[PDB]
Write an enzyme that holds these catalytic residues in place. Structure first.
Site, PDB file in Angstrom:
ATOM      1  N   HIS A  70      -6.645  -4.805   7.602  1.00 40.15           N
ATOM      2  CA  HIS A  70      -5.288  -4.443   8.034  1.00 40.15           C
ATOM      3  C   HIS A  70      -5.282  -3.324   9.113  1.00 40.15           C
ATOM      4  O   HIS A  70      -4.212  -3.006   9.627  1.00 40.15           O
ATOM      5  CB  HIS A  70      -4.352  -4.141   6.858  1.00 40.15           C
ATOM      6  CG  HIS A  70      -4.631  -2.858   6.150  1.00 40.15           C
ATOM      7  ND1 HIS A  70      -5.124  -2.846   4.859  1.00 40.15           N
ATOM      8  CD2 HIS A  70      -4.439  -1.583   6.559  1.00 40.15           C
ATOM      9  CE1 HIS A  70      -5.239  -1.570   4.535  1.00 40.15           C
ATOM     10  NE2 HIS A  70      -4.835  -0.774   5.524  1.00 40.15           N
TER      11      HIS A  70
ATOM     12  N   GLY B 126      -3.305   6.735   5.605  1.00 45.57           N
ATOM     13  CA  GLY B 126      -4.507   7.185   6.295  1.00 45.57           C
ATOM     14  C   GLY B 126      -5.757   7.129   5.428  1.00 45.57           C
ATOM     15  O   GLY B 126      -6.875   7.163   5.958  1.00 45.57           O
TER      16      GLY B 126
ATOM     17  N   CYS C 148      -6.748   4.564   3.556  1.00 44.02           N
ATOM     18  CA  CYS C 148      -7.366   3.245   3.514  1.00 44.02           C
ATOM     19  C   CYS C 148      -8.770   3.259   4.126  1.00 44.02           C
ATOM     20  O   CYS C 148      -9.034   4.006   5.057  1.00 44.02           O
ATOM     21  CB  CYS C 148      -6.473   2.199   4.161  1.00 44.02           C
ATOM     22  SG  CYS C 148      -4.849   2.082   3.397  1.00 44.02           S
TER      23      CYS C 148
HETATM   24  C1  LIG Z   1       1.012   4.228   2.539  1.00 40.84           C
HETATM   25  C2  LIG Z   1      -0.259   4.026   1.753  1.00 40.84           C
HETATM   26  C3  LIG Z   1      -0.796   5.064   0.997  1.00 40.84           C
HETATM   27  C4  LIG Z   1      -1.926   4.842   0.232  1.00 40.84           C
HETATM   28  N1  LIG Z   1      -2.568   3.672   0.190  1.00 40.84           N
HETATM   29  C5  LIG Z   1      -2.048   2.665   0.900  1.00 40.84           C
HETATM   30  C6  LIG Z   1      -0.880   2.775   1.664  1.00 40.84           C
HETATM   31  N2  LIG Z   1      -0.325   1.693   2.389  1.00 40.84           N
HETATM   32  C7  LIG Z   1      -0.554   0.383   2.242  1.00 40.84           C
HETATM   33  O1  LIG Z   1      -0.695  -0.141   1.153  1.00 40.84           O
HETATM   34  C8  LIG Z   1      -0.402  -0.511   3.488  1.00 40.84           C
HETATM   35  C9  LIG Z   1       0.311  -1.717   3.032  1.00 40.84           C
HETATM   36  N3  LIG Z   1       0.859  -2.619   2.610  1.00 40.84           N
HETATM   37  C10 LIG Z   1       0.360   0.091   4.699  1.00 40.84           C
HETATM   38  C11 LIG Z   1      -0.562  -0.197   5.871  1.00 40.84           C
HETATM   39  O2  LIG Z   1      -1.457  -1.227   5.448  1.00 40.84           O
HETATM   40  C12 LIG Z   1      -1.746  -0.949   4.082  1.00 40.84           C
END
Ligand SMILES: Cc1ccncc1NC(=O)[C@@]1(C#N)CCOC1
Ligand SMILES: Cc1ccncc1NC(=O)[C@@]1(C#N)CCOC1
Lengths: 304, 304
Positions: free
Chosen positions: A41, A143, A145
């Site tokens: 992603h 951030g 990920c």
């Molecule tokens: C905001 C956040 C905080 C912690 N872990 C993950 C996230 N965000 C996510 O799950 C995402 C989705 N869907 C947003 C961009 O791609 C992955």
């Protein structure tokens, strides 16, 4: 003396953390040998996340669109491929800090450490467990990920998790290092609900053995039980059913303490039926399930 | 999302761990620049520990009696001195992995990470707090002496603790990196009892703010209180008295959440008087006090 929720020393994993940027999205990468692993992603914009077609989005990306930075130096990307939900970025330089490593897909109930990172830089390390519903209760902000989960056996790092998602309930979902999600989660900005978060029974028993070894014995009772009688109680309290495999892995703890596994099950049964009554065990007022029998053995013996 | 008991990444400290042997006693050493720091009781036999005269025992020791091994290579000892309860072993080689560092003496209520080591090798990392009675509730077995406590500000490691002792109650005592013990403890095999282990009030409030930020809000009530009214309750429950200094440090959390510090104090007051009623906060069934306001800010913002 004393029993703590311990994480593995993170040094070996710190030397593998890099920052990966694609377009305006920046996340973490894991650099092992001449390959950088990161969530696929990274190629998505916030709009793309609603309904992404990763193969189609990847066509519009070249090796030069993936910016990989290790500390303050830029790595040259000479190849890129998508494996399940991860991107593998072939770089022209083998990471000089690559430790001995394996990629392992863990089972629910297994524990691991997470090195939380932002922009390729580590913020901290904590001990986790893959829940029986395949989520993890981590601590991740935007951030984070690409941050990874791992276990260490002397000098070999077994990478088991890569962070990808935060579900609308604040729990976390991710993949193994082959890009396959744990559980039924998909890397899409769509409401995905988690199943029942049952308690890892074998881990609670292992932690009760750790408590006995360390002085907390008030919960030991005059009773015993059977696997079937115990499991009727575990069913009622949303605990995982205990099997002879679990009993077998508790063997070294039963042997060291002289407390038969089924006797410890009867103590757990009474704790479930009566609660703690305002008391604590190893400083906790609830039954801890994020220590495996192997973690208890390791900590109580001083394995380095 | 999510709030975890996080330790600092341990890599910078791992590169400083060495094994120090004197006679038949082996413990951990901290190698920074050309100096190795270790507990002075490394010169003691189990008999010596009963009533040691360290100056007299040190006379019978030469530079060649201290064996320092970093990984599998032997460091040459060219000097040795005793500073309070630590030995400083001057080696002929500066540690190439020496990070930017400071030695800090922390105050009770402050948190830090511990890299537990055995024979100069790390076994794990966990987050601790210097209790108000100057003990730490760690996880240390024989051989863990010389393991250190620390905090990190970007690239600088502030070493604050060095493990020396296990009291007969299973709690831990140690020194700062100048060799001065926290509290009234002495490096002698004599029964030394700890004072009242009061709860670090400001840390509990900081953790309540972390809980609000992360979704756990059930404990928020319709009440407020004053510092003096709150402190009458804190006295009864063996909590540290809250001062305007503590209120000031909670300011950024009060500002981010819009919950005035004294309102959070009233929530804490009701939690003390009524208990949790079988409920949890951030996965805990008791009030957590090993997160400072700075730790909560750091974790909730993603400081690396
Ligand atoms: C905001 C956040 C905080 C912690 N872990 C993950 C996230 N965000 C996510 O799950 C995402 C989705 N869907 C947003 C961009 O791609 C992955
Ligand atoms: C057995 C142990 C385990 C963990 N921390 C510390 C210890 N032991 C101690 O406190 C010592 C004393 N007194 C024994 C040798 O000199 C230090």
């Amino acid at each position: 003396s004393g029993f703590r929720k311990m994480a593995f020393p993170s040094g070996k994993v710190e030397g593998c953390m890099v920052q990966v940027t694609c377009g305006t999205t920046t996340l973490n990468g894991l650099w092992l040998d001449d390959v950088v692993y990161c969530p696929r992603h990274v190629i998505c914009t916030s709009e793309d996340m609603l309904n992404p077609n990763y193969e189609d989005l990847l066509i519009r990306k070249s090796n030069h669109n993936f910016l990989v930075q290790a500390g303050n130096v830029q790595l040259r990307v000479i190849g890129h491929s998508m494996q399940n939900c991860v991107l593998k970025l072939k770089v022209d330089t083998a990471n000089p800090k690559t430790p001995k490593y394996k990629f392992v897909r863990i089972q629910p109930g297994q524990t691991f450490s997470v090195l939380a990172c932002y922009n390729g830089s580590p913020s901290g390390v904590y001990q986790c467990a893959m829940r029986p519903n395949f989520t993890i209760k981590g601590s991740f902000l935007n951030g984070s990920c690409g941050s990874v989960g791992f276990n260490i056996d002397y000098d070999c790092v077994s990478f088991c998790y890569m962070h990808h998602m935060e579900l609308p309930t604040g729990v976390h979902a991710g993949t193994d290092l082959e890009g396959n999600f744990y559980g039924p989660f998909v890397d899409r900005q769509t409401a995905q609900a988690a199943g029942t978060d049952t308690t890892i029974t074998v881990n609670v028993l292992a932690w009760l053995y750790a408590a006995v070894i360390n002085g907390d014995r008030w919960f030991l009772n005059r009773f015993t039980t059977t696997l079937n009688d115990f499991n009727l109680v575990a069913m009622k309290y949303n605990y995982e059913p205990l099997t002879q495999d679990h009993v077998d892995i508790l063997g070294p703890l039963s042997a060291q303490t002289g407390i038969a596994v089924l006797d410890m099950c009867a103590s757990l049964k009474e704790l479930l039926q009566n609660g703690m009554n305002g008391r604590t065990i190893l400083g906790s007022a609830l039954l801890e399930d994020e220590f495996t029998p192997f973690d208890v053995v390791r900590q109580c013996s001083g394995v380095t």
